[PDB]
Structure formats: structure tokens, C-alpha cells
Amino acid sequence: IMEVQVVSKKMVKPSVPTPDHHKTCKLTAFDQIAPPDQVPIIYFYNSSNIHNIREQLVKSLSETLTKFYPLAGRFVQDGFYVDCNDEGVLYVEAEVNIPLNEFIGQAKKNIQLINDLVPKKNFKDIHSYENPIVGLQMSYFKCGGLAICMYLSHVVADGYTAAAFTKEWSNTTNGIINGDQLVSSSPINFELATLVPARDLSTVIKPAVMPPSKIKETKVVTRRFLFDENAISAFKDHVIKSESVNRPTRVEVVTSVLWKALINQSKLPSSTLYFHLNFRGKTGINTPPLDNHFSLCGNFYTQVPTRFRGGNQTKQDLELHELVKLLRGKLRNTLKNCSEINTADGLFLEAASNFNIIQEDLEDEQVDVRIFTTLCRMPLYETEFGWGKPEWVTIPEMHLEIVFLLDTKCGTGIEALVSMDEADMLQFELDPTISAFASL
Template structure:
């Protein structure tokens, strides 16, 4: 499988984080979260064969990411050595672009190999990070397939982002990129540490147990569930109500 990285850069927030928000206390649950990357890959079919139009879309993707990081400013920061706080220093998110010498269909067939999908990611998922103070909270790899399709592979450090908060970030990024009139979420980051204050967890059995779950070379079973477009629309209709509106999937 030939995948070549063609560019690497850091995307910083479009505006600097205010001085009074530079340090964010972690909650107890943030402290206990395993220092691993949670992965996500979004596939997009061919939308244009015009190189200039594609370049404009990529620039739009990067610019909107920069704007989104201004609202989600902790995701552009780095963990502090004290293990109880985050330095919101605007260092930014890692952004890669890669050429894939294969058609996208090879990654979407009924039983794709997991190691192939992992190649679309900017970092190794579900592996304990030995020094989380040196790595970005968010890393993104935009993959260009031979057929013209695109896959956006993303890794989110589990310190701050779980599934729900990751979806909120993606919804905001999508709305910003598409200049959607839908209201963007206004994230609030300080409440969690107020409700669940950070503690000294260096010697806790819980953190040791969590770390053991992500040992190197550990065999972790995976399952794949396939939903077609009709099934997804049915699930959306079942879940939607006045208090829970249907949220859009990230668009490109």
C-alpha cells in the first residue's frame, strides 16, 4: 500500500487565545482518560476534476479549521507537566496531506483490513502516548486517492475529547467551512474541573488499570457495522424531536 505524505504543516487558531484563558484546569475524568488518539475517517467521493477548484476547497478546509480552533482553543494547546492543566498556547493542530496510489473503493469494500484504514490516519490510534506534553490534541491527514476521492483521517487525543465533544467540534468545523447559517455550538471548558476538580492521580490504581488496557501489541477485537443511506435516514427520523434536532454530518 503506497501512501506518500506530500505536505506537513501546523494549523494555528485564527485569533490568539486571550491571556486569562491560557491555562485550563483538567477535570478528574480528563486526568484519568487514557493518553491515546481516538481515530475517525470520513470518505468523500469525487466532487470535481478541476485542480484549481480542489485547491480552493482544501484552502477553505484549512482556513475553517483555523477559525474553529479559535472557538475550541484548548485543542490547539498542549498538556502541562503538572498533569492537572492544559497550556492553551495556540501551538495548533497537525495537518498532513497524502497521495494514495489506490482507488478509494479498496478501503470501502465489505471487509477492509484495519491496517489499511490506519494508514489514512496521521498517527497510530489506541496507543498510549509516553509524553503527552509534546503532541497535539488534534491531528488531521487529508488523503487524495487515485480515483479522485478524498478521505479525511483525524486523530483526537482522548484527554479532552470523547465521542460527543468530538462530534461537536466536527459540526462546528463543518458549519464554518460551509458558511452554514445553523448556529455553531459555543463550547464551555471550565465547568468540568469545577464539578470534578483535578487530583493527584499519579499513584492511583485506576489510571494504571486504564493504561494496561492499551498495552503495546495487545490484541483488541474490532467489529464493523455497515449502514446504508436509507438506514441512516431512518435512524435520524427515529432520534429527532423538538429538543434533539438532527445534526449534520461534516461536509466537504
């Protein structure tokens, strides 16, 4: 019964042209090793009941793009920079013939149904001066409910930058609607290339791949698992029982459970699970762009790869607390390393070390590399555009194998959005330790 109809599609440019001194935004070496993907997130909001809501959202987006000007530009391959030509972000307006309260419940069980809310007019990412850096689709449901979907290029921005863009846009809309007294507008800079410029990394970066890993006829599907508060507490007690780690976190236990299931499904004896660690709040340098860590935008993170090595132990002897302790050791070692670095170039060198480790693991017939992105303890459910908090926030169906960790609307549960090959997923969802949490 549900039909989505695109009503408009255009380019939304920043309210004011980008100044001449900012038209070239040079990218960093972090951006060079950033995954060249466009990554989606979608927020669902209940009915505004504001009559000019579409116009005011377009206007607040233009004003936000004034500050996030590189997002309105186009990537140039030769110099590895962003020509901030104000070509604009892709803006899709659609209308769906059903209320929002007859979709979210269905979508939580079958994420595929969100595909008609995600725009894909995008072209080639690294290359293609014609590919827009940001794509937005606003799908208005039958009685005013809103699906805001953002498709952002990881070469220009990381999770922190996407969140800052979202926060600024929502704050601008909220001020435009309810009075400007509710302002929290702090500047963003985009100038980290001063300290780590893009460079030739033929001497710095591991390249790799191998055939048994390169079985490509994969059909990636996505499933949603909800790890509720009571289940997380049970897992925490099951781990503390061992007391080989103290105070396990929600993310630690949920990632350990998912990782054990992935290892049991893997058919390979060793595994490498890597997430992202944001360099911003965890270092002490203050050379110009790092005077204000929370104002700097662009990729500023390191990969954190935890290597489970199955030697002469069986997969049957795998226990939660060992995965927790491996994750904890790797994170602690990375934090200790970050404490002792003097320049931002050294933190790029640490990120490159971890990148090389991940490539070496990708290149082994014995290691299954699994990507994890945790968005938990990020205030996604407090991003307010001026009429209410999000009803739901998730990541739509991915085309690559990945696991996203999100907070639930309230409480301390975790939504795990797992994307993997269908042949693997059909057994994975029936793992007895996680099958009770699958929305299915």
C-alpha cells in the same frame, strides 16, 4: 498497487491567538480518570470537484480551532492542565494513487489497509508537552475523494467533544462553501473545572493489576462485523421470546451477541463489559458550566460496567436475554443514581465508584474486562462539509482490545469494529452466531 504519499505536514493554529485569560485551561477530575489514549476516527467523502478545497478546509479548521482552542494547546503534567499556546494541531496532507471507489470495498474487508491514512507522529500522551493534542490526516484520492482521519487525545476530550469539534468544523466548511446562511454555530465553553477541579486521587481511585492477565505479547488485530437489519430483527425476536425484557434495542441485542461470543472465547468464567454514559443530557444541575449541557466540552461521562458472574452455571446455559437484562439493570441503576445527585462533584464520585469497580475486576484472575464504545444514534453520517454526506465512517485498527459500535450509512444496521488478540480473533471470527456477519 495502492501507494500513499504524504505531500505536506505542518501545524495548523487557530485563526486568532488564544486570549490571555484563556491560556491556561485547567482539567477536571473526570479528565484525570479518562483513558490516556489518542483515539482515531476516519470519514470518507466523495469527490468535491472544488478547486481550492484544501485551502478552505485548512481555513475552516483554523476558525474551528479558534473556538476549540485547548485542542491547539499542549498538556502540562505538573498542574494537569492545557497550556493553550496555539502550537496548533498536526495536519498531514497525503495523496493516494487510486480512486476512492477502489479502496472502501477493500478496506471494509481488511481494516489494516486504512493504516496508511492514519498519522502517527504523536509522542507520549500523558507527559510530553511536545505531543499534539489533535492530529489530522487528509488523504486525497486520485480523483478528489477525501479521507479525513482525526486522532484525538481522550485526556482532553470525550466522544461528545470530538463529535462537537467535527460538527463545528463541517458546519464552518459548509458555510464557507455554500453561503453562510447554513449556519448552526453555538458556543463551547470548556470550563467544567470550576465545579470539579483536578485533585489528588490517591484517596479516591483503586489501583491494580495481576500476572495471568498480564500476558503482554499480544498482537491486536481488528475485524469488521456488519449486523444487518434482518439479523437484528431476528435477534430481537429471539430475545423477546423470553419476554424477561421488553423492547430490546439494536445496541442491546448486538452488544449481547458480541458479549456472549466474547464470554465463550474468554476462557475465564466471569466477564465485565463497560461502556460510557454521557452525563450531559441526563442530569439536572445548572451551576455555571452546566447551564448549557450541550455547550460544555471535556470529559463528562461515567463508565457503566455490567458484571456477568459465572457461578455454578455453565457457559452453555448462557442466553441472550440474561446479558440484555444485566446491561439493562446496570444502566437503570446508574440512571437512578444520577437522578439523585445534587452537585457535579457527586457525579464525579459516581464515575469514580464505577472506575474502582472496573479496577477491581481488572485485578481478578477470574474476570475478563472488555471495553465497549457505542457511537450509534450519533449522527456521524450527517456530518456534511458542504458537498455530500460521508460515504463511510469507521475506527481504524486499534492497538488495544476494544469494540466500537457504529451506525451504517442508512438503515438501522450496526457495524461492530472488534479489536482483540490475533490468537483469540482467529477463533472468535468462526463463532457460528457472528461468523455470518464478518466481512472477512
